[PDB]
């Protein structure tokens, strides 16, 4: 009810009864009792209503025992989640994801292996915690196999650093891990953490890092003025040429509309051969290629 809900959660765990061996094997037997009983209830066969109510009571007892096992094992998941904390994900979120891993773990347990719950649960705790850390910690999502590759590379790079006391070349790390050096460069480029936009610059407080960046998508008024003047000048030089030449060039690059047209496409509405239409087209390109009608367009690029 106060601040620091980590303390509130730890007290919300409370004085749960820790389970010595016969207690949790009896609880697991009751789990099986409830689960097989509700499985029998799930069948569509008609039995006595009293037997159905008894099986429902067993199912409720099994659910209660499942709950009790959860509150018994919230201690171990808290003790294990703290091992992987302070790495971009919050401590209580790690606790909750480990709780997901533990409720996945206990569901897949059988009493045939006479082992304690710790050595079987810790595998799923570590697996779910590292999967959640791979999936949700970074702002850009990295798949779990990429995460395990990159942090294996990080740990062997740290081993190299503590071994020879010097920064290794990427070629050495590539050849000692049997991947290509360009792959190593790519994966350590991928393995980066973004910096927040709202970082203060220094003594000044109003000046932030966010106002220093520009945007390439911003429209430049000079560019738009150049574009509309290019359109106007192109229309003017089209009007400068002959009417038929203007008409044939207006369709070859589809200047009038959004679609260009081929020489065979315009040979029906106007009715000339491919030879003549391409000849007059190339004549128009040559005439516009003359240096007289170039300075009006050469600076326009």
């Amino acid at each position: 009810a106060t601040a620091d809900p980590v303390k509130d959660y730890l007290k919300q765990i409370g004085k749960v009864p820790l389970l010595n061996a016969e207690q949790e094997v009896e609880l697991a037997k009751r789990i099986e009792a409830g689960l097989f009983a509700e499985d029998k209830l799930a069948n569509s066969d008609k039995l006595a209503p009293k037997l159905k109510r008894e099986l429902e009571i067993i199912a409720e007892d099994g659910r209660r025992a499942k709950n009790h096992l959860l509150e018994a094992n919230l201690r171990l998941v808290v003790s294990l989640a703290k091992r992987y904390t302070g790495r971009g994900m919050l401590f209580l979120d790690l606790i909750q994801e480990g709780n997901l891993g533990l409720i996945r773990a206990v569901e897949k347990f059988d009493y045939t292996k006479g082992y304690k719950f710790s050595t079987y649960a810790t595998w799923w705790i570590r697996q779910a915690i590292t999967r959640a850390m791979a999936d949700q910690a970074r702002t850009i999502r990295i798949p779990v196999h990429m995460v395990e590759v990159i942090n294996k590379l990080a740990r062997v790079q740290r081993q190299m650093l503590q071994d020879l006391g010097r920064e290794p070349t990427p070629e050495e790390l590539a050849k000692e891990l049997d991947m290509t050096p360009e792959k190593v460069i790519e994966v350590q480029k991928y393995g980066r953490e973004p910096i927040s936009l709202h970082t203060p610059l220094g003594e000044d407080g109003d000046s932030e890092f966010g106002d220093l960046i520009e945007d390439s998508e911003a429209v430049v008024p000079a560019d738009a003025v150049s574009f509309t003047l290019l359109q106007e000048q192109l229309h003017s030089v089209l009007d400068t040429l002959s009417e038929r030449e203007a008409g044939v060039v207006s369709m070859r690059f589809g200047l009038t509309d959004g679609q260009p047209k081929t020489l065979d496409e315009i040979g029906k509405v106007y009715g000339v051969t491919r030879e003549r239409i391409r000849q007059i087209e190339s004549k128009t390109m040559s005439k516009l290629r003359h240096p007289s009608r170039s300075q009006v367009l050469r600076d326009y690029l």
Binding site: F253, G254, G258, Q259, P260, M285, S286, K287, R289, H290, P291, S292, R293
Partner: protein, 254 residues
């Protein structure tokens, strides 16, 4: 013939689309396939994405589901060329393994740069030999039978580059003391292209010292008539200036 090493794969864009694999030809295939291989050849080995190649082949309206079409064109290139000469990154296509002299375009820039360096150094024989080798590079019209307005763009660009290259060749031929083949080439090119002012200025310069004045000014009058009929403007002041100094017959530039 002296640069035909073993294992050499020669590529050519200045003439038509062809491949020389140690002296034997390779079937470059479809006209769109020829355009695709040329578009990879102009980029000196970029990984160029699929959409860019699709735009390069066709332009504004490529068929919608033709990405697999470009995929099977790439398959055609990979099975007709070496498996390792073409490599794909992130969906882009890239031709590598191109040594010196494999592309005629790279040799063309190399010869142009060497000719410019020899002109800077003042040499004439080596520069003449370099541009003689350069004029043997083009074989007919550049990019023979390839669609795409992109292909039209590098076609007109390479044609203009060839025009300035022949302008420089004719200019050094005039300054070193060559006139007969010079006026022959200028007449042939003005027969081919009638609306270039620079080549007709070169005609005036070449005929001005080779012993020909009447037909030079007749060609100039024809140029004025055609330029007034088709453009209705006045030619460049350097022209009128060149015709002017010609008129008082200065022997300074002999």
């Amino acid at each position: 013939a002296e640069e035909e090493e073993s294992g050499a794969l020669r590529f050519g864009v200045l003439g038509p689309v062809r491949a020389w694999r140690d002296g034997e030809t390779l079937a470059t295939g479809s006209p769109q396939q020829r355009a695709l291989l040329a578009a990879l050849l102009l980029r000196e080995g970029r990984t160029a994405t699929a959409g860019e190649l699709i735009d390069a082949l066709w332009g504004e309206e490529p068929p919608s589901q033709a990405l697999a079409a470009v995929r099977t064109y790439a398959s055609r290139l990979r099975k007709v060329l070496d498996p390792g000469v073409l490599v794909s990154e992130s969906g882009g296509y890239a031709v590598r393994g191109l040594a010196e002299g494999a592309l005629d375009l790279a040799r063309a820039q190399d010869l142009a740069s060497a000719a410019e360096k020899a002109r800077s150094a003042g040499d004439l024989c080596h520069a003449r030999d370099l541009l003689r080798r350069a004029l043997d590079l083009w074989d007919g019209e550049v990019l023979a039978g390839v669609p795409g307005p992109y292909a039209q763009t590098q076609r007109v660009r390479l044609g203009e580059w060839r025009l300035q290259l022949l302008e420089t060749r004719l200019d050094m031929d005039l300054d070193q003391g060559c006139h007969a083949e010079a006026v022959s080439e200028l007449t042939a090119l003005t027969a081919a292209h009638p609306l270039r002012e620079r080549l007709r200025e070169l005609l005036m310069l070449a005929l001005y010292r080779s012993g020909r004045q009447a037909e030079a000014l007749a060609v100039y009058a024809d140029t004025r008539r055609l330029l007034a009929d088709e453009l209705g403007v006045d030619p460049r002041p350097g022209l009128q200036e060149l015709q002017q100094r010609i008129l008082q017959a200065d022997p300074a530039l002999a």
